[PDB]
Design an enzyme around this catalytic site. Structure first.
Site, PDB file in Angstrom:
ATOM      1  N   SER A  95     -10.767  -1.932  -0.328  1.00 17.70           N
ATOM      2  CA  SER A  95      -9.943  -2.163   0.396  1.00 17.70           C
ATOM      3  C   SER A  95     -10.036  -1.950   1.447  1.00 17.70           C
ATOM      4  O   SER A  95      -8.916  -2.749   2.527  1.00 17.70           O
ATOM      5  CB  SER A  95      -9.320  -0.572   0.503  1.00 17.70           C
ATOM      6  OG  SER A  95      -8.319   0.226  -1.586  1.00 17.70           O
TER       7      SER A  95
ATOM      8  N   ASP B 252       1.376  -1.751   0.047  1.00 15.60           N
ATOM      9  CA  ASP B 252       0.072   0.069   0.235  1.00 15.60           C
ATOM     10  C   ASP B 252       0.522   1.476  -0.082  1.00 15.60           C
ATOM     11  O   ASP B 252       1.702   0.715  -0.745  1.00 15.60           O
ATOM     12  CB  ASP B 252      -0.984  -0.016   1.211  1.00 15.60           C
ATOM     13  CG  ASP B 252      -2.538   0.458   1.034  1.00 15.60           C
ATOM     14  OD1 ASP B 252      -2.885  -0.243   1.331  1.00 15.60           O
ATOM     15  OD2 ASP B 252      -3.007   1.833   0.656  1.00 15.60           O
TER      16      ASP B 252
ATOM     17  N   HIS C  95      -4.046   5.836   4.558  1.00 18.34           N
ATOM     18  CA  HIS C  95      -4.545   4.090   3.832  1.00 18.34           C
ATOM     19  C   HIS C  95      -4.353   3.545   3.758  1.00 18.34           C
ATOM     20  O   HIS C  95      -4.718   2.302   4.467  1.00 18.34           O
ATOM     21  CB  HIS C  95      -4.661   5.045   1.983  1.00 18.34           C
ATOM     22  CG  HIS C  95      -5.368   3.491   1.079  1.00 18.34           C
ATOM     23  ND1 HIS C  95      -5.302   2.109   0.710  1.00 18.34           N
ATOM     24  CD2 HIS C  95      -6.324   3.195   1.041  1.00 18.34           C
ATOM     25  CE1 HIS C  95      -6.312   0.918   0.547  1.00 18.34           C
ATOM     26  NE2 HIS C  95      -7.244   2.508   0.322  1.00 18.34           N
TER      27      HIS C  95
END
Ligand SMILES: [Ca+2]
Ligand SMILES: [Ca+2]
Length: 269
Positions: free
Chosen positions: A215, A32, A62
């Site tokens: 996600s 990521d 994220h």
């Protein structure tokens, strides 16, 4: 005080923790935007394949979010992950902007397979197939890594790459009603679903934030796989992947949900 996000209890992680299963000794790589140091995370190592950000720290938020769903520490603060004892590795394949090249993503997978990762979390994807990417998926798999990827947030009736590849376990998102979230991609290649709406997790700046997306659903399954691995240390990626599917709760069409909602209670029995 520590709170248990709704998705953690939806997948029944606490039921597994009460049996002694917390992901201890299982190595999980998060490909990521990086993972920021956080008081509710224990980051064991990692690498960055993003030229221009040699550090594994997260400039986006994220990756830190993803990581906390898998392994937020079980203690007296913040939240709790599905596998709070898993060994977490920050593999930075996307930049601060939140995007990266297949080249960086391929390198991160290669890295994972060379460093004996058990599970690789890829909360990313493209509508376009990539030979480079596919080869990296396949190479990590034959090195024993279970690759778990998000189906995508376009809401379309086909799923993203690399989740579409046979050797990737494709994860879509459900809501609190056990319905597929509107944005969750579905169709052929979809393996399973997990909570993806309003997911609270660790976020940079030593705080917590709630996000939505496939996600966010993916890490619940990466986490569930670490629980299973701890319980069945001799199982391969394939064995883990089929057990999760076989034990998921049916939610209706396999077209929309694949095998169903992941169930860490049913899986660690
Ligand atoms: Ca905690
Ligand atoms: Ca697939």
């Amino acid at each position: 005080a520590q709170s248990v996000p709704w998705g953690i209890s939806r997948v029944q992680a606490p039921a597994a923790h009460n049996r002694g299963l917390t992901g201890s000794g299982v190595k999980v790589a998060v490909l990521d935007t990086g993972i920021s140091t956080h008081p509710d995370l224990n980051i064991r190592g990692g690498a960055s394949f993003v030229p221009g950000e040699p550090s594994t720290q997260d400039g986006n938020g994220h990756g830190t979010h993803v990581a906390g769903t898998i392994a937020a520490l079980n203690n007296s603060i913040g939240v709790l992950g599905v596998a709070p004892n898993a060994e977490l590795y920050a593999v930075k394949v996307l930049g601060a902007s939140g995007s990266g090249s297949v080249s960086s993503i391929a390198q991160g997978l290669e890295w994972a397979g060379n460093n004996g990762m058990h599970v690789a979390n890829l909360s990313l994807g493209s509508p376009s197939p990539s030979a480079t990417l596919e080869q990296a998926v396949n190479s990590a798999t034959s090195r024993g890594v279970l690759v778990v990827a998000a189906s995508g947030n376009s809401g379309a009736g086909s799923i993203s790459y690399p989740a579409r590849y046979a050797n990737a376990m494709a994860v879509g998102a459900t809501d609190q009603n056990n319905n597929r979230a509107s944005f969750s991609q579905y169709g052929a290649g979809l393996d399973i679903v997990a909570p993806g709406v309003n997911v609270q997790s660790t976020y940079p700046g030593s705080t917590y934030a709630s996000l939505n997306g496939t996600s966010m659903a993916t890490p619940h399954v990466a986490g569930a796989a670490a629980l299973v691995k701890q319980k069945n240390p001799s199982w391969s990626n394939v064995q883990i992947r089929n057990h999760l599917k076989n034990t998921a709760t049916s939610l209706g069409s396999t077209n929309l949900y694949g095998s169903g909602l992941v169930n860490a209670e049913a899986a660690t029995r």
